[PDB]
Amino acid sequence: GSHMTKPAPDFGGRWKHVNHFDEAPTEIPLYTSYTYQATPMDGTLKTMLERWAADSNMQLSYNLPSDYTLIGPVSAISTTSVQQAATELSAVYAAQGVSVSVSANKLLVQPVPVSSGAKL
Q1: Which listed site, 57, 60, 69, 74, has its alpha carbon 20 to 30 Å from 23?
Q2: CA distance 102 to 106
Q3: Which CATH class is domain 33-113?
Q4: How many CB atoms lie within 10 A of CB 118?
Q5: d(CA 25, CA 66)
Q6: What gap in Å lies between CA 81 and CA 117, rounded to an integer?
């Protein structure tokens, strides 16, 4: 037996559905300010920074050996300044050995030595 499927056209409105813009794409008469905050979609620090930078089309430099989850007070940080966000994060993250900063539209994550404050 053979059931040769002959090429048949579909029905609907995908062909007639055209995408274009007669008016302006996005008229926003205000200085857009993205709020950098921890969300229930990141899960880990890496993913959080990824989303943060991605939204503003910025780059990320994760120089950490592994990806860690949010310590807790991260979601309590909600600022429109990426520089301030990193500044606040690095303050509470320092205890974990993580220092985040922003340089040249790039987020740089560097580990800080806080395992032994009285070492030789």
Answers
A1: 57
A2: 6
A3: alpha beta
A4: 4
A5: 40
A6: 31
Torsion, CA 9, CA 14, CA 16, CA 20, rounded to 10: -150
**Residues forming beta bridges with residue 44, ordered by sequence position:** 69
C-alpha angle 18/20/22, rounded to 5°? 130
Backbone angles phi, psi at 10, to 5 degrees: -90, 170
CA distance 97 to 115: 8
Name the experiment that determined this structure. NMR
Q: Do the strands 98-102 and 59-62 form a parallel or antiparallel pair, or are they unpaired?
A: unpaired
3-state helix, strand, coil in the chain (%, to 5): 20, 15, 60
| Rg of the chain in Å (alpha carbons) | 23
Spatial separation of the C-alpha atoms in residues 19 and 26, rounded to whole Å: 15
Write the DSSP symbol of residue 83: H
Measured over all CA atoms, what is the biggest interatomic distance in the chain, rounded to whole angstroms?
83
Supply 98's token pair: 């993580």
